């Protein structure tokens, strides 16, 4: 169990950007710019800096060329310059390695702290950032599939309660979770900015990065991404969806970048900013918890996720989950799911919903 | 092979209504009225008469209580009273059983002919119908999932080219179809009213009724149907979707009524009313043909369909398809499909797309 | 009254394209391509040929450079090649001037008949046209404001009953109209393809072209056109809307091109294909007939419209409407309208709504 | 000028509910429940307690039968019970009249402080509230016009800078405003929850309540409200819109309840939670600032607004604005507005846009 420091936690505002290492920068650019329509803040031979339609900070996504595709940093913006100092002190007390750069790790970020957190994830905390033209009313640029915000990250980690307690001490509040009747936690969602999530924990081998999520204004915008991917004959890069979530109540889609980094497109979750916001716990065997319409969760969604780097740029070693596997208990050979609690009708034994089994 | 009569074909306007036999009228009422929001034109202990939001004829759907759930009639409106006489002459020349009732078979229909057609299907042809209040501007009644029109029927039959040729002689024009490189036809779509389909043929054991389709105004209306069925904890009655079709380009959903009759909800196909409307043929192994986003077709979609009745109310005997099965050649153990023709990446062998095999 | 020819009417499928004369081709191209997103089928230094997202015929709009902005032709597709011969015999019997070009008037159209019709409008009838790539599943090209079909034309003419009867003889069926209790007709809508309209008649001084209409898939696509025009700081070229129509029940917007040609964007009217489709008549004083939400109709919408050309390319002389004016009877100084019939609450007198 | 207290400001989370006095409780019920689809948390013969589709606190709107239609309270939720003590100390030092009830003023609210604030408005601050079934996934109940959240209030007040400085001290941050080139401020928007606004100030005679605003998920939900009101033949209770705002960038509609209280329906503004969120200032003569599409703003939108009560239940006296009037300088007889700055084409002298 990760102890609560004496030092005060940094005041985190929100998730702000991710730095992803990619193997072919031009292929990646084609995906995030030509397919997804993200706005280029800066680019050169080594990096692409991208932002969403409504962003005023320099970027929400940095693509960095490197030999091994991986998450290099998931970056949170903090409330003041002094909060970056607080972050350094807090993580030092946790016994974590930290690196401080007064002039930033990436362009358009100033004083920044990166840490190898207790779950092995590379986090950044910063305040200073270059403001850019906020494109929120540039409807001359607006795409039929326009990505308007960065919304959240999702992390794969083998011990969800351990992580959850650490994120609670850092000031994140859990909005929803998935548990069973035998004491196992499979997933949790937690926030700072008053939406369902800024980060989320998914039970599995880790540290790995599950996805980064961007939002759209309306559901039809998500449908358009799917439609465009069909027209580009890259529908094989739609992993799962589109759907309605149980957890979060958002309409959603998961797609895969050229290095298999998973991106979620999301819209219309709900307000969580009250401190006693009712926490919602779903049972892992409820077949409406992940897709509210009951559609089956594709097995790659549970098994595949991105490598993460340490501060030297080396891939973090994976620690195997020993708690029960959500895949196995729901759609594997001994799995079970229900539509209506206690009703045998609409239940699934040892296979997925809608007449499918695991490939 | 079905000969083309010397007698003139009736001028068919559109699909107009279906009569389905249902086993429990109150449970069927709940589904069609309380879940789906269709509007009651007439009802009693034996039947419920339903119409869509923009309809002016008496009804689009008649639920008739009986012992065996089945299609009893699929009805087309013809242009003039004289076309009913033409339908009668045409089918008598084909050597089909016909029955004529000057005062209709169901309420709100007047002079009508029912026929056991050459494919075993119970067709009705009529002109006269009782006009009712057209609810098209009754936004005080409009539901978030409102069904606005009847769009089409889909019929299962063993020999698609044989049925197609017969429908062409009747004046239906083929818009899209699905074939393979060795000359098998798996499905065909054909219209009179200048949309993609008024009826459609799906290759399989027949005669059976695949579905009846209603349209909505917008894609979010279809999303709401899914969302409501989740809230009612009947997501197990969502069979397939929602999706974008390849064939037709419509946004779609398939759901199952209490007797397992399949209902499609559909919106935003394209104009086909020009006589040289370009036909579109798809390869059966193209994994974007049915769902444009490459999502897998649930196997029940290929295997299950409603019984149909003859003019005495007995179930029509089923005849086995001997051409190749669409299920088997795409998603069965020996099936295959592709995202990009010729590309092994994004292809599926011996299972469905997205990492599933047959349950 | 325009007599019915004994010659059979051509079988008209739908409205197909308009040829608009424009004064500055580059400015016009910026509006129809860069702002509105129509797809180029052909261009050169004299003309731009444009189509909507789901079209397979060569074009829905031809922009032709010329000295005076005007409608040059409103073209209907007919069902077979022989229907062009029918159209020629029909308009000849009507006493109208006609011109037949076996290889077409504009690129991508074959054998074509143009006429000065009895209302003074330049109509074209054709069958043959060059097919192009139908872009209906080209979602890589799809705009947030995408125009998906050509829907209809709207003509300004002084005597609506006279024009309506002429159109009915040609096979158009009236779907909706606007009348008063005194028996005046102010407008009528009529169709061939099974929607509310392929053309429509607006009472006023004519012949003038009121607008050309394109459809979108959804309401949000119309919203996006407005939002884009705001970002381009040309919100002054939004004339009226967005709104819900009473007549037609369609969601709508009216905008002005650089020569003040009016374009409607339109979605979600209803099916009219049955021969006994119920006809709806609105009262001219009903403030929900034009905009269902009761928003006022700007006077420019009633008074302004495009010149039309004769077959020589000269402007057609205009005839003044002598029947009552819809403008005057609803929003002029002696006009009125209501929200609920016979209720002075929500009524407007000598004054527009709201 | 309103001084800044030595006492620390309460930590305000968001606008939470409004209490509106209405004259005919049945007619109001019909509007808010039958037309608009709000959900009943509690009702009796004197009061209806309503909530939006995604709310879990007891209510977002209280309709209270009374003899004079008016705003009785605009309530903000604070982060902790001790924040209600802070609000009490803060307003006392301001020399504002306060009243504190441990068991609340309305049903479903616990310990609560009401104040007559320095602008004459009745604010409530509370933490304690009765939790109710969150209906956010009750799509069996979801209306085609569904109102999903309470978004904001908008207040009419004569001196916008005076008001702004006071709200800033209280911890609200200004996101957008409307000024001219002569030093006048006509309007300002400001927030706690990270949206464009929790409350907003409109320059005018006041204190008056301009409107209360509810959100929808999508733009088509607002369009459905208009379509329904047409079917119900009450399109005359549509005041302004639907439209796209300049300020806020939100899609919007303004409608009027049976006592003429103005309700806005609103969707899809942007995130403002960062402390250095760029402030946007519009010029008052910019014809895209209120409606981005340049549709004219009807003069009733500028002149009409609801009475507000003091803590005894009496109507607050109205103080006249002496700063220039937004109405007069844009759409009055000597008004002006532009489409493109510096372009005569698309400008309007002495009248509203669009004819
Ligand atoms: O403004 S109207 O409701 O009369 C109307 C209805 C349909 C149209 O296409 C139109 O331009 C005008
Ligand atoms: Ca268990
Ligand atoms: Cl999920
Ligand atoms: Cl399909
Ligand atoms: Cl405004
Ligand atoms: Fe997520
Ligand atoms: Fe279908
Ligand atoms: Fe029109
Ligand atoms: Fe507002």
Coordinates of C-alpha atoms and ligand atoms in Angstrom, one line a residue, chain C residues 152 154 178 189 196-197 210-211 213 240 245-248 250 252 254 264 266 289-291 297 301, ligand 1:
Chain C
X152 CA -36.1 22.1 -56.0
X154 CA -38.9 28.3 -56.5
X178 CA -51.3 29.3 -49.0
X189 CA -45.7 23.8 -54.0
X196 CA -42.9 18.3 -51.2
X197 CA -41.5 20.1 -54.3
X210 CA -36.8 33.1 -56.0
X211 CA -34.2 30.4 -55.1
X213 CA -32.6 24.6 -52.9
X240 CA -33.5 34.3 -43.3
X245 CA -41.0 25.7 -42.2
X246 CA -44.8 25.3 -41.8
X247 CA -45.3 24.5 -45.4
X248 CA -43.2 21.4 -46.1
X250 CA -38.5 21.1 -43.6
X252 CA -34.3 25.5 -43.7
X254 CA -31.7 31.1 -47.0
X264 CA -32.1 27.6 -49.8
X266 CA -33.3 22.3 -46.7
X289 CA -47.1 28.9 -42.1
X290 CA -43.7 30.0 -43.2
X291 CA -41.6 29.8 -40.1
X297 CA -40.1 36.9 -42.6
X301 CA -37.5 37.6 -48.9
Ligands
LIG1 O1 -41.3 29.9 -46.0 S1 -42.3 28.6 -46.4 O2 -42.7 27.7 -45.2 O3 -43.5 29.0 -47.1 C1 -41.5 27.5 -47.6 C2 -41.7 26.2 -47.5 C3 -40.8 25.3 -48.3 C4 -39.8 25.9 -49.1 O4 -39.0 25.1 -49.9 C5 -39.7 27.4 -49.2 O5 -38.7 27.9 -49.8 C6 -40.6 28.2 -48.5

